[PDB]
């Protein structure tokens, strides 16, 4: 009954059925020659997360964390990356060689990896819970200006503040207002964080942004993507954010380069 040792990982959150993390990680571990590592789903509230992680034994190598637990994960960890602190939340907990848990935010990699570059002037469409990672990612892509295109000036102002704390210029553009055309005319890229049916209202107005990362991937192409493509631009969907989020977790958990083709085969 001599067998190789193995490690345990999981995704924590609630609801926990939509996450693709188990699929992408098991596809990676099998490609990396670690077929006995396990990756489970654990339903977990923000309030439950610290007690849950605190009790895990040394065989637990890493956790992915999704809503509603990302703030709690950052607070729980005894070490955190600078970019997780800057985003203000963590979607990743990695066991350290000598026992601690390190928090990171690879949602940032989702956007930097999916987009590649965002040029000099980038838009974030929306002001909801995924917008902070988009802002920090755009700043990490070296954009000079981040414009928050959203309806709620209050939620937008907090993202403008974050853009500036990241070193970029920032400002707000009312999605429903007269200033949108000028924001689009000078934009090099956009990240759209809102649902497809909400973005469809503004698809023609956003069509001229040359490169658009749409967080939505089902159905595809979205109305937004269709307009961008009809205008000669490039539309990228949210599966590429999920892919690039996962690359970084797999590398941190296994210490091996991400098996990218194997993970692409599991993407959907």
Please identify, by name, the CATH architecture of the largest domain.
Answer: 3-Layer(aba) Sandwich
CATH class of the largest domain: Alpha Beta
Shape label? globular
- The number of distinct β-strands equals 12
Q: What is the element string, with H for helices and E for strands? A: EHEHEHEHEEHEHEHEHEHHEHEHH
- Give the N-to-C terminal Cα separation: 37 Å
Biggest sheet architecture: 6 strands, mixed
PDB class: oxidoreductase
Keywords: Mycobacterium fortuitum, Oxidoreductase, Seattle Structural Genomics Center for Infectious Disease
Assembly: monomeric
Entry title: Crystal Structure of a Shikimate 5-dehydrogenase from Mycobacterium fortuitum Determined by Iodide SAD Phasing
In a few lines, what is going on in this structure?
Keywords: Amino-acid biosynthesis, Aromatic amino acid biosynthesis, Oxidoreductase. GO terms for molecular function: NADP binding; shikimate 3-dehydrogenase (NADP+) activity. The protein has 13 helices and twelve strands.
């Amino acid at each position: 009954h001599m067998v190789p040792d193995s490690r345990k990982a999981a995704v924590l959150g609630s609801p926990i059925t939509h996450s693709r993390s188990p699929q992408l990680h098991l596809a990676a571990y099998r490609a990396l020659g670690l077929p006995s590592w396990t990756y489970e789903r654990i339903e977990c509230t923000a309030e439950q997360l610290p007690g849950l992680v605190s009790a895990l034994g040394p065989e637990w190598v890493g956790l992915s964390v999704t809503m509603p637990g990302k703030f709690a994960a950052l607070e729980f960890a005894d070490q955190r990356t600078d970019r997780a602190q800057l985003v203000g939340s963590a979607n990743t907990l990695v066991r350290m060689p000598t026992g601690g848990w390190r928090a990171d935010n690879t949602d940032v990699d989702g956007v930097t990896g999916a987009l590649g570059t965002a040029g000099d002037s980038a838009l974030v469409i929306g002001s909801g819970g995924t917008a902070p990672a988009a802002v920090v990612a755009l700043a990490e892509l070296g954009v000079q200006r981040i414009t928050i295109v959203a309806r709620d000036e209050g939620k937008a102002s907090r993202l403008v503040d974050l853009a500036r704390r990241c070193g970029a210029q920032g400002g707000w553009c009312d999605i429903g207002g007269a200033a949108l055309a000028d924001a689009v005319a000078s934009a090099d890229a956009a990240v759209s964080t809102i649902p497809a049916d909400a973005a469809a209202v503004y698809a023609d107005a956003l069509a001229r942004v040359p490169r658009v990362l749409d967080a939505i991937y089902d159905p595809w192409p979205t109305p937004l993507a269709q307009a961008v493509e009809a205008a000669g631009g490039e539309a990228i969907n949210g599966l590429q954010m999920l892919l690039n989020q996962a690359f970084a977790q797999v590398e941190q958990f296994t210490g091996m380069p991400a098996p990218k083709e194997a993970m692409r085969a599991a993407l959907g």
